[PDB]
Paper text:
Water molecules are visualized within the antibiotic binding sites that are preordered, become ordered in the presence of the drug and that are physically displaced on drug binding. We observe that many antibiotics displace bound waters on ribosome binding, but also form additional interactions via coordination of preordered waters, as illustrated for tetracyclines, streptomycins, spectinomycin and kasugamycin.
Author numbering:
A (entry chain S): 2 to 84
B (entry chain N): 2 to 101
C (entry chain G): 2 to 5, 10 to 51, 57 to 154
D (entry chain C): 2 to 59, 64 to 207
E (entry chain I): 4 to 130
F (entry chain J): 5 to 102
G (entry chain B): 5 to 70, 80 to 227
H (entry chain M): 2 to 116
Amino acid sequence: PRSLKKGPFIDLHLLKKVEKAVESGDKKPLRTWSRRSTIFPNMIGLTIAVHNGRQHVPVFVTDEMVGHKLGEFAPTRTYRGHA
Amino acid sequence: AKQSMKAREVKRVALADKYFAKRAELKAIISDVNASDEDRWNAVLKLQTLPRDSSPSRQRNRCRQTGRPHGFLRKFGLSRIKVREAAMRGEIPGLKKASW
Amino acid sequence: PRRRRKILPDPKFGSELLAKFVNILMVDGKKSTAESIVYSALETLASELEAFEVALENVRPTVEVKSRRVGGSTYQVPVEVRPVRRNALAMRWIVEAARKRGDKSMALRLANELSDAAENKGTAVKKREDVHRMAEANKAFAHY
Amino acid sequence: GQKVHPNGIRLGIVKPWNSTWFANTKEFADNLDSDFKVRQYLTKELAKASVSRIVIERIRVTIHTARPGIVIGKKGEDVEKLRKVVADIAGVPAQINIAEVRKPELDAKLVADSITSQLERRVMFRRAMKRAVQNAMRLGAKGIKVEVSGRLGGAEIARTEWYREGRVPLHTLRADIDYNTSEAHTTYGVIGVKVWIFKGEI
Amino acid sequence: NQYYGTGRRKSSAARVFIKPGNGKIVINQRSLEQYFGRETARMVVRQPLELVDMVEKLDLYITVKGGGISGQAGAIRHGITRALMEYDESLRSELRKAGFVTRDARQVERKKVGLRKARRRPQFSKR
Amino acid sequence: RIRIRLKAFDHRLIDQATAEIVETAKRTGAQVRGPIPLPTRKERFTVLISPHVNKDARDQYEIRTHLRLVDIVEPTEKTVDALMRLDLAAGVDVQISL
Amino acid sequence: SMRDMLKAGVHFGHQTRYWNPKMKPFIFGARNKVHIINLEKTVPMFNEALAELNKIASRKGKILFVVKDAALSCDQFFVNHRWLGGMLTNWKTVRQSIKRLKDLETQSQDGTFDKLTKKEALMRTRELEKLENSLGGIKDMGGLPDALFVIDADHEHIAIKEANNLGIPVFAIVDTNSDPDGVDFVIPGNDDAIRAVTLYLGAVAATVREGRSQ
Amino acid sequence: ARIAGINIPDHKHAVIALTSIYGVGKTRSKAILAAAGIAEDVKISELSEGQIDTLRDEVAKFVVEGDLRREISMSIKRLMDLGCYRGLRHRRGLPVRGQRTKTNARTRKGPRKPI
Amino acid sequence: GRVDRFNKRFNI
RNA sequence: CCCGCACAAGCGGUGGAGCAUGUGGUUUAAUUCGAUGCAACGCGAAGAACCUUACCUGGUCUUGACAUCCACGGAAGUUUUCAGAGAUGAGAAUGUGCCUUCGGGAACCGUGAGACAGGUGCUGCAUGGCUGUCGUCAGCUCGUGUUGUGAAAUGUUGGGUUAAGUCCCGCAACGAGCGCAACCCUUAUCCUUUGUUGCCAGCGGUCCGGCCGGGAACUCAAAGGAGACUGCCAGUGAUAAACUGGAGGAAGGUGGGGAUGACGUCAAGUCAUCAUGGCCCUUACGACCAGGGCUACACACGUGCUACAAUGGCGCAUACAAAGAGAAGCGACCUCGCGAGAGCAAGCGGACCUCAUAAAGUGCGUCGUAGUCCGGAUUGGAGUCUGCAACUCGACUCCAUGAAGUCGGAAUCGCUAGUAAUCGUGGAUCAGAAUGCCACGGUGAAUACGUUCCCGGGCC
Ligand SMILES: [K+]
Ligand SMILES: [K+]
Ligand SMILES: [K+]
Ligand SMILES: [K+]
Ligand SMILES: [K+]
Ligand SMILES: [K+]
Ligand SMILES: [K+]
Ligand SMILES: [K+]
Ligand SMILES: [K+]
Ligand SMILES: [K+]
Ligand SMILES: [K+]
Ligand SMILES: [K+]
Ligand SMILES: [K+]
Ligand SMILES: [Mg+2]
Ligand SMILES: [Mg+2]
Ligand SMILES: [Mg+2]
Ligand SMILES: [Mg+2]
Ligand SMILES: [Mg+2]
Ligand SMILES: [Mg+2]
Ligand SMILES: [Mg+2]
Ligand SMILES: [Mg+2]
Ligand SMILES: [Mg+2]
Ligand SMILES: [Mg+2]
Ligand SMILES: [Mg+2]
Ligand SMILES: [Mg+2]
Ligand SMILES: [Mg+2]
Ligand SMILES: [Mg+2]
Ligand SMILES: [Mg+2]
Ligand SMILES: [Mg+2]
Ligand SMILES: [Mg+2]
Ligand SMILES: [Mg+2]
Ligand SMILES: [Mg+2]
Ligand SMILES: [Mg+2]
Ligand SMILES: [Mg+2]
Ligand SMILES: [Mg+2]
Ligand SMILES: [Mg+2]
Ligand SMILES: [Mg+2]
Ligand SMILES: [Mg+2]
Ligand SMILES: [Mg+2]
Ligand SMILES: [Mg+2]
Ligand SMILES: [Mg+2]
Ligand SMILES: [Mg+2]
């Protein structure tokens, strides 16, 4: 994982988008491609639609998700079984 | 390699040179032990906002004659194929077939 | 091959026969490991080189089978064994036998096998007897 | 089988390098690229001047040419045009020297270029090859081999034709084998020419 | 007066200075027992003196560099042999017959392209 | 003391460059600790020779960097001025340290 | 003479079973299953040969003996070890090997064998002796023989065939076991006894000297 | 002998015997023993009831046995309930740490299942 | 739980 | 009739296990393309997080990302704000140079236009170049001559001999060429030269460290030489080639290893290194961007690594290498950290400094044959570092966990000596990312009766 001395990574574009979503109200799903962004405490209760390569998967952020990357909640590969 | 792929490398080398000192400054702040969390945090966010192609790790060494992105030798700046062609024509000084 | 080596003797006793034995015991070029096993075994068994000779005498085969294809049929023909190959097989069979035993150290396994060999007891001696059994079951095919 | 490059195997035995400069790793790839660009420029610019070989020392360029007059020009005007451009490529002060090739029929590159010129002007490939061989042996080659490969005479099936005269002992390292290649860009595609000229041992 | 011999084996080279004495052997400022743990290495070093019967009649000052235990022991034997022939030229034939005068020219064969080692080819699958 | 380190890719070229330096420096009154042959670097390169596959088909090349040291002990005015008027053969890299 | 040739042993042929039936004119009889040459034919035929060998000599014509003593003692030419196939018909090639024999005779004098490597100098001398045995007696000929003298037409059938091909008068000692076709001047007799051959060799050597001299 | 609700073996050196406890490896066993003052080569048979009681106290400083098993179970359950990538890998019984599944992955997948 | 380790481990 | 690790004789493997890796298949939005019997499958790739990247999804551009030409604008540039995932739009601040025939051209930036650019699109069965392969196998040919109506033959076959169409002898062939061999590199011995950054025999000092003064001996460095020729000797043989043994010699019969690959074969491989005929696309098959994928997983195959232990594991102590790399680099010492590492910071473009501590070994102790003090997979927790960024998908560390595995069926692979086996070490690629590859030393075997058999090949 990212070294603690550098802090948790988040894309600035998402950080500002979250801050504006928090202050405004219970806004719409936040569309992002920032799979690499850490889930911060202030994202709790937001829906982030996280890109998985072809679609923005809605991820309702809970307290347990904090510290994880957004990409963890948006699987990229489809697999249902071989037969 | 395609002409566009050769143009991407040129663009990556130029941006890397153009932002080299700025990146060095920000990375110094981020890694500095005796810096404020706010200063480190602002530096982390600023380093993102620079073009990704300003990062030297974005550059792929390509054969300077063909643009081949594999089989590169840094000594010569060429792919294995163009090294061998130049070597046999006597265009690489000192380089001969080695046995031991 | 279609177109037809110097062994240094053992330091402790000056025997090329025991130097060969160490080499057969040796794994992975670890000669010092093998030397310490053999010398431990001989000391335990014990002269050292007399007791080794007695053990070899009871494992050495004089005859064995060799597969010989003739007329699209493969028989197990008895052949004489040459002085060198007699020693070579004896030493190989003692080591094989010693390795298969379920005692603690190879030093102890080997000493026991060499002691058993002198009694005409162990699986090295059994192997010789099985080779002699095979050569006598095919005494018909001797000078075919 | 595939054969070793005759020139490459004889480098530092009986065959010199065409680039003779020292560099550490820092400058080595830059020097190779500038050398490449100098040879690229001079090969094109002196395409009608029978250039056999371009030796680069560090910049000092020696052009081995069968026609020294056409390279040099009137009062050395043409060589001065080259020297300014070579200085601009190399990014250092340039000297252009001009070595004479006295016998172009014995120079492998010029013979190879002579054949490929003729092939692009639709000369019969056997005629071009046979005269190249004849002329070399007339001018005292110990031997010559010429190989032409491709769609010879615009045939659909490509093939390799070669002719040899005298000795061409390619396994003999002390043999002075002059070897070079050329490509003829025809209407049916690329015909490759290889020429080996044996000038004796040592 | 001291008689010298260079000895070499694998990548080892030994400098052997012999003089009249009481059978002292110093190798890299250490005794023979200190330097060489292995008894085969000690045997190899002492072989030439044992052959010519000068075990307790000569002092050896030895330095050795390169290779391993067996390389260095073998280098030293070659060096002692050469020093003994400087000491006494009549010994050549005895030392030659023992095989000590030969420089054992066996070296590690280079690794080769396509092989795992010098000769070990990679495993073949027909099918 | 002037240390002169010569490097080249050919030993015959480096030996002549040293031979010139020792001659000119010794013609003038200078103590010359003569050409010390230092270890040749052999930089090796293995390359695949096919344009595609055939992983076991390789060429092995080397550049030998030859290296010579000449020390000019107790030198004069005429020494250094003589060593500034040598055009040593191109392909010889001269590194003068003091 | 018929007397000269009796001591010589010209009249003795080969065994009767091994005969050529084309030699039936020249056989008198058969003693002890040995065909006897009719010397009433021989001496008339040997003289008309020597008449012609005088003429060809007298036109400064080169006579190739196929022996060493007789050819050297009238300043003409010999092949006394195996006739190399195509000596005359492939003269253009074979002459290049005579040029090589000449060169190794100079490289003896110039000292070249005492200059190069010892073991590949004696090698160059081994050629000289091999080329000497083959090409030595036609070293200083420098063309084709104007006539060919042969001992045993059957043994030297290759030489005779080349001479016919080119148009070179063949003279030959044809025993009772040999074929006369391809011989312009058949000389019936004995080719396998030394006193008969040395008689024949001695008598042709007479007319060569005499023709050229006169 | 009885520590952390398990029988630790009496015949083994104490440093090895303590690694019978789930949650105690070689490093923690050395740490437990260094703290308790017991030498690491001493057999559990040799030790006295008082010394075994000092080990019981030192072991209780760590989370071990059923306390550790429920901590691990809950940590895996959390991931599965989150539905994070790692959670889904736990659900599917596949490698969790980016290993190849085209081949291998038999420790997670178990024995081969013919078609 | 996860908010606590986040706010502790990372210095903002 | 011969040969080759072809078999046999041996030694160690593969096949079973876990893992790494490639491939098939299946799956997928995409799992980019190529390599497919030997001669594809740790192959192109000497290193896919982003980039690379060729693929997918979506967002975008249309003379264009990359050239030349034309006209019109305007110095380049630099700094910064807003929107946007970014591409990219909008700005805003600022600069206003250089050539100065004082005319203006030229940098470099835009915008318009259409000649064109662009294409990792197709055809390796249109090609060049390069490569594999039979095979480093001893072959393959030509001229002239001769023989045959002729295709062709001879030479090149034959007797010996050789690693060899190697050499000798014979011979309707005589010669020659390409191959063989030799010349090249390296390794083994010696000599000469030079003597630092390497060396330390003798000689003084000494803090006992080549540390110092010194010495030039020796190791070594690397230039030049010498040396091996069946040269000598004996026997065998056709008064031959050669063979067998012997001497001397560091080396002996090609001393060892490498480079070196004949005419050709497989329409073998590569249009995706590059180049190139033809074909095809041109507001798209070109171009830019973010995110995903190339890492998917019922499964099959290939190549490896690690094991299964006691010839071993663990702990402590302690020996002996070679080869190599290094400036946006190698990074000591010191301090901090259990550790990965961090901080501070010498030295070094290197025989100097650094990577860097060889490991196996040896001594002592312990374990005592157990699924274990074997094994180290998997998984949890906590970290470090590189990097805009390690979710998909990095490496490494610590604590915890402690799987299968008890030496592997039929079958099958490698190796003849400093080899195999085993042990570490380094390098290329590379920000980071090896169990692969390329290279380096350490320790160091067994066996070869023989040619019936299997496989490939040579000659009649
Ligand atoms: K435990
Ligand atoms: K995966
Ligand atoms: K091709
Ligand atoms: K012919
Ligand atoms: K094409
Ligand atoms: K990706
Ligand atoms: K592997
Ligand atoms: K495997
Ligand atoms: K132990
Ligand atoms: K265990
Ligand atoms: K990752
Ligand atoms: K196995
Ligand atoms: K690396
Ligand atoms: Mg292109
Ligand atoms: Mg990169
Ligand atoms: Mg090795
Ligand atoms: Mg652990
Ligand atoms: Mg992985
Ligand atoms: Mg076998
Ligand atoms: Mg397996
Ligand atoms: Mg394609
Ligand atoms: Mg594929
Ligand atoms: Mg491979
Ligand atoms: Mg990508
Ligand atoms: Mg923005
Ligand atoms: Mg195209
Ligand atoms: Mg093809
Ligand atoms: Mg294909
Ligand atoms: Mg043939
Ligand atoms: Mg030949
Ligand atoms: Mg050769
Ligand atoms: Mg001998
Ligand atoms: Mg094909
Ligand atoms: Mg992308
Ligand atoms: Mg892949
Ligand atoms: Mg270096
Ligand atoms: Mg390292
Ligand atoms: Mg363990
Ligand atoms: Mg067991
Ligand atoms: Mg072999
Ligand atoms: Mg290894
Ligand atoms: Mg043959």
